[PDB]
């Protein structure tokens, strides 16, 4: 990994285009204007790629020959960088500080900024920005996941009195989903922050190496059928196949995914019939858990619940819901975003039946199809220092008020009523609003402060 | 990377699934059902993921140990692995079949099939299906590039009479907008394989290590201004700012955002009096790209392009079509994707205003807003050999007749009509089509067949 090519291609020109005598280039990060956004995963950042030794006299070669071809032209800054090398031994003369991971924020107000510690280095601050913004990823996918944890948790609620399994109701099958391997490791883990079942293993070792958890891993899976091992068993031998899995896996939880063929005659026949006998034998340790995948999610998952309520004994709960038998589960991972889960809850209490029935899995809703513009997260100046004088700066685009940036030294505060505020100007300079809630976790290429994934998680939690 | 701890976790648990006595377990990738799917990206999973001595004792050892504390069980495969370690010396007993990236192939198409070449791995197949089915990401971004030039093309063409300048008019500014570092050069090398203009710089690096060019770099960038390097200087000073940038960069084409405040008076007053002087002068080699960045994308360019005709001296081509001169021209990079940039070119041709006026840059739209459900990107086994004989092996949900999977032995051949056609059950043994183009890319933990992105642009090309 080399650090000087890994920024946009503009951005190498940029340290000819600031004002002559500018000592100081001072930048935030915001969600502008999903009310509010867990803020988690600068500390990956943070460690992967911008501490310690980062410059070294073969990749400013390197950059510098890349970016000759690249620009047809030279416009590298070598001698910046070589200073970098020669006077900090490659470590970066800057200072991040940043609101602590975990923590719950409403949108429009400061969550890190970035500044250049030494007046010869003003253009590294925004060299940088590329590397950092792409934090609007894992703290796209945690905040989500937690809006989608808010929804499993009201109808469960509802639906059963209590919160019992909440933190299992929402599994991560989106690796094969994502565009790439870091990708999912970062969606992963992300993901984690609220719930506690994956299937994307690579999530489990980032955790590890850069957060840490008090027990051995932050994740759980069980085993589980996928189209191909059902279906090489031959088409008419789909009974065959269901038997021998639940019978290799009887004493541990299992998921069989039972749509290869036809849904509606497995829940039916073969569980509801055939094979009966190896289901109500079943453990409330080890419980069945049927997979539909495919067609209407609602449609299915209520016609499936339909089925296995006039095969098997369903009891009615404290609050008049319906509960099938506890060796008895269903797993909707097909379709499902955070707008089709609303609607399967909400169908399935219209239809009395307990949402301690279901859990659900999602994979490109998930971790895929989310966007920068999602939570509207940007990264802009907001105050420099040039001739030895600071001036408050910003963008204030005429077609769209949005688009506005904040102004001077900011700072993140707890009002009276225990509410968030972002001081602008430098105000929180004065005392009125107590201390900065923002911490140093990053100064002169070293971190500074860091966190635990559990206490991330706990930054994390419900109300 | 320990590919043990690189797929979904329920393959982990197959092994103990497929039926007993089965030797060979044969499997399919294809984009069910953007009638046509560029092929690419497959090489650099090969020979980053797959390749070589992919399995230690170490790795062995650390996989166990993390799936026992996942599962909260003991169902890893460690004599299947350490059979591999032993006999192959940590080689793949693999091969992979493909059509040659860069090809042009209708949905509907087998694009590479999977097979195990010993007895004993039958169950490695599918294990990597997780790792080969994320080459859905460069496929799709590939393919999307490719519609948006056409769309291009058609619109150059009609108001121009050529295509000149056509490979340079999508710009990838989506360095920032992607999920991660590795996405990022993935997706900028998938743009690459249609466009010549890119600031990912990240992709340059990927295609020169897993696929190469004659040329010392396959993409290119101009120097620029972002919002920083306008602001910075103060509100009242954005001519400054302006006069600063396009006489620093007085010989070379340069892009300056013009919207910090107001992108209609920048036009018409800043640009268009204030400073046209330095402008008018510039050489048809370096002319200034103005760059909007806010509002309604098509009503912005329509109205900047109105104020610079007023402003400037211009010329009706061949075709009817206003054109700038030579020294000016205009970049739209905000809200840019597939749908909107053909908005904004029919907008333009009822307004008779050249395509030659005009690039378009793209970032969340060109490298994040997309998914694996887009080009329906599947992995399905279609063949299994137990107990010495051979079996076609399909899905076919009773709700969806669009997720039924082909049966059998695959070959993908020409049609008397010069059209595509994927033979089923074998088939193509009988030799009615002609030739499979299907190649062998992998065998036993070797690539055996490989494409530079020389081949790959040229296989892309657009009829
Ligand atoms: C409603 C089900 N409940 C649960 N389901 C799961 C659960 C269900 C299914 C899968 N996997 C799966 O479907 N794999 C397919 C797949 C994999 C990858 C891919 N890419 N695509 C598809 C899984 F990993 C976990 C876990 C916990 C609970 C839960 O409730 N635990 C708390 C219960 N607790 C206290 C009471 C006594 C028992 C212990
Ligand atoms: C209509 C413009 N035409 C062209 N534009 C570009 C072009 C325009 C703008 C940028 N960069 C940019 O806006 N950067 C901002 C930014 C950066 C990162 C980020 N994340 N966000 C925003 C760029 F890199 C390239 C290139 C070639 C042509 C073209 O036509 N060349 C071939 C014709 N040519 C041949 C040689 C003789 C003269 C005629």
Redesign the pocket.
Same mark, same amino acid.
Do not use: C, L, M
């Given at each position: 990994f080399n650090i000087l090519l890994a920024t946009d291609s503009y951005k190498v020109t940029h340290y000819k285009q600031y004002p002559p005598n500018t000592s100081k280039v001072y930048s935030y990060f915001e969600c502008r204007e999903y009310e509010e956004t867990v803020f988690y995963g600068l500390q990956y950042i943070l460690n992967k790629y911008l501490k310690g030794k980062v410059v070294t006299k073969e990749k400013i070669q390197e950059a510098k020959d890349v970016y000759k071809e690249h620009f047809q032209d030279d416009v590298f800054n070598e001698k910046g960088w070589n200073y970098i090398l020669e006077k900090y031994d490659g470590h970066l003369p800057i200072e991040i500080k940043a609101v602590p991971e975990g923590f719950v924020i409403p949108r429009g107000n400061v969550l890190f900024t970035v500044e250049n510690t030494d007046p010869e280095c003003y253009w590294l601050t925004n060299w940088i920005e590329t590397i950092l913004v792409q934090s609007w990823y894992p703290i796209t996918v945690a905040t989500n996941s937690r809006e989608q944890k808010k929804i499993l948790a009201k109808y469960l609620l509802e639906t059963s009195g209590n919160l @019992? &399994?909440l933190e /299992?109701?929402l599994?991560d099958? &989106? /690796?094969?989903?994502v565009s790439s391997q870091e990708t999912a490791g970062i969606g992963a883990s992300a993901h984690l922050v609220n719930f506690? &079942?994956? @299937?994307?293993v690579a999530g489990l070792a980032l955790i590890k190496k850069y957060y840490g958890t008090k027990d051995p891993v932050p994740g759980?899976? *069980?085993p589980?059928?996928?189209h191909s091992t059902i279906t090489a068993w031959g088409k008419d031998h789909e009974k065959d196949a269901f038997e021998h899995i639940v019978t290799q896996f009887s004493s541990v $939880?299992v998921?069989v *995914?039972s749509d290869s063929y036809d849904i509606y005659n497995a829940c039916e026949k073969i569980w509801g019939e055939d094979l009966r006998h190896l289901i109500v034998s079943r453990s409330?340790?080890? $419980?069945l858990?049927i997979?539909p @995948?495919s067609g209407n999610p609602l449609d299915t998952v209520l016609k499936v619940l339909e089925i296995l309520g006039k095969k098997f004994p369903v009891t009615e709960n404290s609050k008049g819901y319906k509960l099938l038998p $506890?060796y008895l589960? *269903?797993?909707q991972?097909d379709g499902v975003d955070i707008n089709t889960l609303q609607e399967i809850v909400e169908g399935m209490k219209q239809k009395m039946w307990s949402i301690?029935?279901?859990?659900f899995?999602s &994979?490109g809703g998930l971790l895929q199809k989310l966007t920068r513009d999602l939570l509207n997260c940007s990264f802009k100046c907001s105050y420099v220092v040039t001739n030895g004088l600071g001036i408050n700066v910003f963008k204030d685009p005429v077609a769209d008020p949005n688009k506005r940036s904040k102004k001077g030294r900011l700072s993140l505060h707890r009002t009276p009523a225990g509410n968030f505020v972002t001081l602008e100007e430098g105000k929180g300079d004065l005392e009125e609003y107590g201390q900065d809630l923002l911490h140093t976790v990053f100064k002169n290429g070293k971190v500074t402060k860091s966190y635990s994934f559990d206490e991330i998680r706990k930054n994390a939690q419900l109300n």
């Open positions: @019992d &399994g /299992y109701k599994h099958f &989106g /690796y094969r989903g506690k &079942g994956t @299937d994307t759980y899976s *069980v589980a059928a996928e $939880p998921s *995914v409330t340790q080890a $419980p858990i997979r @995948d $506890p589960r *269903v797993i991972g301690e029935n279901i859990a899995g &994979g």
